[model samples]
Target chain A: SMEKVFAGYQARQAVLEASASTNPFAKGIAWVEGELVPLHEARIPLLDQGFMHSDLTYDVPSVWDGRFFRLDDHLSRLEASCSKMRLKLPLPREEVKQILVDMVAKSGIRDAFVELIVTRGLKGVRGSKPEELVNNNLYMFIQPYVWVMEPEMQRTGGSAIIARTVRRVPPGSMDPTVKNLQWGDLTRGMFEASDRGATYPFLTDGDANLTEGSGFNIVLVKDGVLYTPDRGVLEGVTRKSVIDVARANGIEVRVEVVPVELAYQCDEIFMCTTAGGIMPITSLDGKPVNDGKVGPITKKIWDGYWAMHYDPAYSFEIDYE
Target chain B: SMEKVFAGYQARQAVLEASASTNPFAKGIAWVEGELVPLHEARIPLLDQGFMHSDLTYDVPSVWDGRFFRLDDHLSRLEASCSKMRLKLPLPREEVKQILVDMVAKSGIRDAFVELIVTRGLKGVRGSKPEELVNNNLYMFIQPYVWVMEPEMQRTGGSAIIARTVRRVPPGSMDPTVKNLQWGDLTRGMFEASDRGATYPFLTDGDANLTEGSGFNIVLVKDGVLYTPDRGVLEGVTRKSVIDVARANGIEVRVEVVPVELAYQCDEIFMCTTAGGIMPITSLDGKPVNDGKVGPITKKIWDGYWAMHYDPAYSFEIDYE
Candidate 1:
């Protein structure tokens, strides 16, 4: 009788997802609360510590041309995040990968932005011992591919300002390597950028060292050497790809402390993230980067970056029936 | 027809809350979306930026003896948080107060912990422009009273350690004054505390300036003067009450930069939060705090703190029939 009731609930949920005779897959699909539902209909209870306290970690991998780029790398990071956060994945790594592939396949979205999240689940009560929050919840969704930097900006090159008021949350407080939802600092940086009439904003640490942009990693090229911040920055998968792509192309790359002042002096700059592959920044604080045109190195990496997405070695093709 | 379907949906929601003929009030009540629901049943969509990015602000006020302690103060802080976070409340301040009072009245809970939250709501799509994601969400709930420090520890005095690996999120990044869910640092500190067999943990900034504990404010007493950290700590309501109580009781108080070393040298220490009015730390890093006894000033403040809960000047009694 209990199983029957659950089955009925699931059937009703499916009906809920596909109401109005509309295709639920039109938008995308989400895996939440042990079932796959329409992306828009996915919900988490208010008591989830993840929502209540940001006690969670997540990773995003972009699916392009019916394949996921750097899916395993993203998965590995998610696993590391869960371990660092002391959160256990509800499913094993292989199972989670299968689930992601199945969701993308079922949605039939060729190019999509897939977000995988694990949050500390609801508990018996709030005041219980902290360790009682061991129940972790897994949530994932595949949506239309998102661009951290829009396509138009990517072509003309992006514009940005180093936020005067906002700084990146220190690494000692929130480790930037772990993909987590501690975006308060990043969101504030975006507001600053918007106010300054810039496409994006870069943040610095206390010592005026460049940390990162809102949702992307920042890079600068000086004297033909590509430099990215080593401290207080996400070890972005896209950034890793950029580094690999650069080294493969015989371009010198350096991952070390980057001062904000050097950004003004650099000859070229670009931002990298899963949402936007390789976005060149032409203007910084209204001053142009070199000739205010996309640098040759940036263009080379941008083309090489997407080209790698098609390489069978780096892309995982979804099995769509 | 749409209105009727909506009414039916609401009716079904009410039924869902009151299932099993069990009193939903056993836990408490919550105000979510536009209606009051069982606390356990309150939920928010998965896409809420609050849960997705920790883009939200919240406040918690405690009710004692069927009355709220400094409810207005908490609400005012909530308003400030909203203003800082660029979120708007769904209802007016007075209306929100009425809802909170009504929910507590309906639950008939004499002692409760009421939480008010404002979150960046679900929007059209992920990659939309920055300003396009302006929809805000409000969620509130009242539940059995919670204690940041357990009763047993309160009596014997809580044990604590300064987190060696973790630090408070910098003010330049995420303002501690605005109550937020970026607890990744605090959560990590708690794990360190648990591993060290301590009841609580305190964090310091990179400069070794004392910040705060997992969910409470730290205070140290030396030469009969109370001192708390001025930076990288929440301007906590309970901490404020303690300051007020101290001044009223003729105890000199100093709200200034408190180095981590001052904590070790202080004659007495205590942690304050809405959950636990005044929690003394008699032991630090396995060492006794002046014979490991709750200091006289701490006892005075603790007694004075609860007494404020009953004062008609500060308390707003719920009219429960």
Candidate 2:
């Protein structure tokens, strides 16, 4: 299939032309071992348990218009996650912030998806005590900004399926509050969503209560109030930002155990994530969310979300020079 | 802490001596991109979802006395896992076998731990359909053989705790049959076990039914009958071997729901894994398992497990030439 995709004179010619280009930062930049390298050339050891066993935790912060959104919150959360996972951060929080700013400045990308990771590095002799394990690893990278739901899809609103074959890995097994590299449930649900010709997939817990989607949290609007599941989700920064904007506008918000049945009966629905901001869900499981359009409140929040990115409290302007 | 560990003159000197070793295969060998690389030099891209999202499936087959144990079965399971995870094996099954053989032969380690991984390499444009994602990547590495319980501990029997704060990710969220890198729960549980001064940690499902440990399957023997949990486990090859040996010796065996309470009451308990043939568990939750000695039945099965590795039906003797 790959061969076929690159077959034919037109595609072959295009590949050769693209290969001839000399730019290394076309993709982005990565900070590895004190050096900012081209993202395409950045790598981690194959034997690192971070890759082999998902023994790692990470946080993502977005940069828009040469400023970081919620930078401090993301950094604070990353520290909290590392502490919970018993990983000693390889660098101080201030140094990490500097690295992120420098990475974004070097990449020269006005809009970027930035990630910071801490992995339980390679262990010592087999079966060694936890304290004797090797040092934890820190990694950071910046790539062109991505949307969980693309801009066009967000405008037209997206469709999703309540995954039939999967459930969220419960909180007891893997803490959802500390974002880790445990996306098995989310990735599997995505396949089911794709197979069903849907834009996304949302999961429920074993109790059949709503959880969240692959990279976003689900919110339901009922009688002009916002309701979202308080458990089994990565306490998303965007979700908090949305809540802040909503409350400022006098709209009621409740973080509680939202039942799956309520989603079907809700007046409207929207998904929130750092990547996609606030994305309206027009249809779910072949049924319309109200009239299958982006609701007025959702539109208002969407417009307000971008303005909040430029707000002084949350935005950290990058010094490119 | 790491600095303190290496601060003493003896430790610092030892590190320098070890770093000066010239043998490339001191650790082991890795097969990457058609070349046999030193295990230490093997690397994977940082953007690989295999590391970032645990988007991969893998299988481990062991080498004993320069022969591969249950090579065919491991290969077959790797194929099955690929299918279940919707990944296309990049090479033919036969080629994969040859690669493994060559890797082991080059490593020259009579006893080795071999791993094969296939990951969702990368995707195209954001929100692209699954079919449009880039080709999957394959990785293979061989390391010195490891044991779930060290040989010294195996002789004296080891200790474990029923993890209090963690449970296995449910089968619905992640099918346990496919050996993927969803070890978040297992890693978290390991910390709890270590903190409690135990050698290992075993998880239970949401229903309080026993599952498996970090890298091994748990088995209990009571009144000359063997029982192991039938679900939420990896369906380990060593577990199957133990079952076969038990049945051959006229010991009754049952694969069913094993509750947590039965573990405390069982007459004998042992762990089965490729890394450790049959590891006897003496103490659980700080209480002795029965008389806290390796039972007669466990001894017999352990001896038989090693002999079975020499059986032509299951062993493929590697050609080291």
Candidate 3:
């Protein structure tokens, strides 16, 4: 039954590739079983420890001026994570980058989300034994880059719920520094926010100190000084970029624990992830965060970030044609 | 490259199966997609929130008398974990049980280990985005069950190092009841033990009170009373079973915190796990634990457990052809 499903999926992918329409902006090749296949038919075993044990780690294709953004930083984080988890990548970083570029060139996508995934190869059905570590598996997939909410989501600002759920396993317990796949706490926080009718949830460390958003770093402007959590949170590339931008703009930035009480009292608040960029937090847990609207500081940072990305000098070259 | 590698692995596994001559005891099966596959072919993605985010949870198969010792109890723990994590099982418990039994039957082995795993499906590459919860992959596998040591090794007992790592995330920070996959602290503790040349390492709560082993529940006898950590550790089925046996045998068992100093002064010490059963701890950090030998109380408890398992009335039914 398993082999049949796998074969059937492979066959379908082959058919899709044979009939695919060509578009320069949407070009990227899907490799299946050593052959270029269509993205729609690519399948992975659901029972693979990657899916079953949440044994996966990943990196995002940074969209910088119609091409991949901050490729170096993203790859660095990926390699660091692999080292932390003791996962042996099948290819060197340079080879990985070349393959990604080649796959994107063939697919014809100008702007895309490129994913490089490494998995612990199959072991017995119950997942890898505690003592048994296996060879790593690699997967690269490309998709059109699209944001769920428009960039205007940052302009309009959004309310966030302070979830009762705490970020499980603090940095001391499990170094949150490693970007390995394991996200039960983040999921729980998201569900809690959804159940409470909030768009996003703000999480705190064990001591109820503001740490980061579910998938982004949290930054608050208090009396014109920007405050954010430090290494205890996943050191996001986008987050680092924002800090650089803030410092360039002469904005004072502080990386420390932001207590919930202070968060409620902050002058302005915002969040940043690889995808979200910079989003304003208008209110927290139904209480107005600042002036109950996107504040001047958030607007300034968002405008600065977009202007830099959209600038011709800042954009990278892409052979879309 | 990723797809090619994945497909090549499937063919490799098939070849290995075709050439295999020995059929050891069938311990468990990996439920992939919807089909049961061999344990060794079960792969997990490294980007899975469970692995990336440490979002997975697990239950160990308890064995006694050459059979699953407390299948019901272990299943209950699994159910409890799912409930605490708010995870929905793709297949019902009965279906999972049937799959487990059939897989074990095929392997033709007895006295093994079993693991039922559930992970949030592939949502995105970087694990920062939430994915729609998909299939709950179940895995069941077995290993040659070895008692911690024979009578001789048991008499010498085992040594454990006091890990510098702290269990900082209290139950309030994250529900300790839920056996979620985020196990950075546990892994760190294991690393510490390995570095210290000890078979296992022990961890304490932030307050320096003895909590539990990196993977096992701790048991100590002081002033003729048995004591163990309460609610701070992953509640172990073996720990509960040992406590039950102790009570049935007229031994007083208390669930309370034991400071490291007090724990070291106990009359006897042991660690409990589904795999290890009840194993004595005679030495700790190169120092003798309770006179550097298995204590009388530990011996009595071990003998009582063996007797219960071997007693036909209490043992699992076996009809191996």
Candidate 4:
């Protein structure tokens, strides 16, 4: 519970520090009209476009050691998403990055997560005239890194269920490239998976190809080659790093559609995210996969990743903590 | 800008006041932890089952003339939705209603909008084991009855664009009746509509019949008879009242499938909501509908609705506002 609170505070502080920073390494901040205030101070009417209509998009940065990882890559993807959805970020990329960096500096947190959000501003509860468009809120924040798995759980692999719930809308129906905030369908799928007694559910597209976990990207290994679903899923930054690391280690990596049957047949399965890093899945719905333990290949990649990214040599100082 | 701020403040105040009331007519409050906080404050971490996977459902009360319009119907729909979605509200229906009433009464505002949201508690962000399941937040607020169209604008009627966006997942794919917080697709549709010059867009099913608006239901008048698409759309309480009012006034009402083509060619068109009451549609895709003016039938329904519901004698009273 304390960890949750720390995570929330760290996330908020990260954004503030990033906004207040003067260092070139830190991103700039853009003040969203109403977001900077305390949660209570930020009032979005039930009918606000973002709240009522679900017209918003967001990206969260994974912290490694004490610094934001691949800040430019995350921001570039955020901009591309905003452009695709026709939602404007109030500030330029450079300005946004600077604000983030300033916020992190002010926050004084050495290691934390950051959340960047862009919403289509507030529209009156009853609907409004075209002139009211300017009222939308664009927001960003950073907080202390709260890892999903405990230290003990990270060493021991976890289990997941194969959810019968499928991705209803195919890529043809709606491109998943834009990271819109309206995610009710995805959440429902995740719930179904959890109800089936798995820590997380492996979601599949209509054709039964492995798409992703509810939010994180999924990766599996077969005969030493790494496989994962490509573009059809949210282009996750952490997932990208996993791929880069794999290629750097001379591992053959393939990004394509993988069938659910293949997930059960794989030698190793794991999920990737900014906070959790690479977590191996020991079983698919309680059935053991490859002796039901974290595999050597996944461990090797994770160890190398930590050495390069999370080592003390790469750490930065911040005061917020 | 001032009006928007005032409206926002009013809404925020209503939620605050309503939660403080002791009246049985109002819904009572349950402290998630200890104190009453804003809806956002009661957030579950991204790792939680509800936040990670969209394992939550919500209900919003449409206020008319200082009282919750069809409170029972709204609650009933929420109940049905929870059941269909396999979710369990932490409190009984009556208990929840009392909290809502208490909130409304404390706010001391007449005629306000209220939102009741229920979410599964915190879990791993990556769709893993849910740590808890009873985390739910109840929020009520007072907001100005936004005139979907200003009185003068109503005379000109409103225009709607035909968007390429689809309504939602197919019926059996996911229960359409449940009002879940994950609405990324609907918001995308709204975004498309906003891009057009029209005030809103009409979403269609596979058959192209008007399924519903992004957030509200739709209806039309043809040959002096009222027609609305049936159960496939949300069971809107306002839509119910409009039908009842039409039947009471001796106008023929038909709850049948009506295509978009039929809507575009209707003799008179309008929309109904707790806030908007009954509003006329004068145009579609910038083309005038039926001479591009609020038709006789449209005005008749609007006038009749106000006559029965908006009279001060028929309205409820609260202390705070």
Q: What TM-score would each prediction reach against the true structure?
A: 0.91, 0.92, 0.82, 0.73
lDDT of 2 by residue, A1-321 (tens): 113211332343443346435536546899887888998789988878788788888999998777899999999999899888888779988888888888877666667789889888876323667667649888899987777876667777989889898899889889999898778888878888878888789899968799998889999998999999999988999999989999789999999999899988988899999986888999999888899988988887777777787799989788978
Question: Where does model 2 exceed 4 Å of error?
Answer: A1-23, A124-126, B1-23, B124-126
Candidate 4 per-residue lDDT, tens place, B1-321, comes to: 224433654675576466445543233222333344443333222333343334566776655535566676777888788776555676778887766666555544455566666555443234344444445443344344445555556666788776675455444334557876555545556667667767766777656777676566778888899888885567777777777668778888788888778877788888776656676788888788888888887776776665555444434333444
Q: Candidates sorted by lDDT, descending order? A: 1, 2, 3, 4
Better of 1 and 3 by TM-score: 1
Q: What are the candidates' C-alpha RMSDs?
A: 9.5, 7.2, 9.3, 8.4
- Among these predictions, the greatest TM-score belongs to 2
lDDT of 3 at A113: 61
lDDT tens readout by residue for model 1, B27-56: 779887878889888878888888888888
Off-target runs (Cα >4 Å) in candidate 3 are A1-58, A82-90, A117-140, A146-152, A308-315, A318-321, B1-28, B43-54, B62-66, B122-155, B166-168, B311-315
| Higher-ranked by TM-score: 3 or 4 | 3
TM-score of chain A of 4: 0.80
CA lDDT of each prediction against the hidden true structure: 0.83, 0.83, 0.65, 0.63
In candidate 1, list every pair of residues with a backbone clash: none
| DockQ top scorer | 2
Clashes of each: 0, 0, 56, 77
